Paper text:
The cation diffusion facilitator (CDF) protein family, a conserved family of transmembrane transporters found in all domains of life, ensures divalent transition metal cation homeostasis at the cellular level. CDF proteins usually form homodimers and share a conserved structure containing a transmembrane domain (TMD) with six transmembrane α-helices and a cytoplasmic N-terminus. It was recently proposed that the magnetosome membrane-associated protein MamM is a CDF protein that acts as a magnetosome-directed iron transporter, as its deletion or single point mutations within its CTD abolished magnetite biomineralization.
However, a large number of the MSAs showed that L349 in ZnT-10 is homologous to M250 in MamM. M250 of MamM is found at a similar position in the center of the β-sheet as L349 in ZnT-10 and both residues have similar properties. To ensure that the MamM CTD can serve as a reliable model that will allow us to gain better knowledge of the disease-causing mutation in ZnT-10, we performed in vitro studies of MamM CTD M250L, as a representative of wild-type (WT) ZnT-10. Crystallization trials of 6xHis-tagged MamM CTD M250L produced a crystal that diffracted to 1.79 Å resolution. The crystal structure shows high similarity to MamM CTD WT protein (PDB code: 3W5X5) with an RMSD score of 0.21 Å (316 atoms involved, for further details see Supplementary Fig. S2), indicating that the leucine maintains the structure of the WT MamM CTD. The free energy difference following the M250L substitution was found to be 1.6 Kcal mol−1. First, we analyzed MamM CTD WT and M250L, which both yielded SAXS Kratky plots similar to a folded lysozyme plot, which was previously used as a globular-protein control. MamM CTD WT and M250L spectra are very similar and show high content of α-helices, in agreement with their crystal structures. Accordingly, all the in vitro experiments with MamM CTD M250P showed that the proline substitution causes severe structural changes while the M250L mutant preserved the WT CTD structure.
Author numbering:
A (entry chain A), B (entry chain A): 212 to 291
Amino acid sequence: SHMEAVQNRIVEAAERVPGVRGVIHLRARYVGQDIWADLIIGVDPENTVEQAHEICEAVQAAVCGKIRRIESLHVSAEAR
Amino acid sequence: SHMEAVQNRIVEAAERVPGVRGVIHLRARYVGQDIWADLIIGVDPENTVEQAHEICEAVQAAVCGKIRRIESLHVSAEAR
């Protein structure tokens, strides 16, 4: 599938960002030629809530920078 | 509405739990006579991710303990 290549690129890009302890969940869909995606990342339980927010914002920048067709990306965090 | 009384009870119960800095979002719906609800609470940005998780679990217990018709409640947290 065209989509599985894209999903591989999101996961790979997310996992390279400092503080990411793996991708817990990824759901991606096409809206025309654009991708909209929902991503959940793992983070250190001892990080602050503010740190987990910064890591999500860094994941969003890194993913959207690498995958140009992404036009909406939501990133949240869970302790792992 | 029957629902607005219930929504008032969820918000009130959530806000009385230690570490809750207000209810950011509440969406509740009936599935037959049962309530299913999605709640977002505010928390101190300097709490740990583990602390924010404990506060959500305490909100879930407190809300479900006070409002017997709730059969599904999801609680997440945001810095505020």
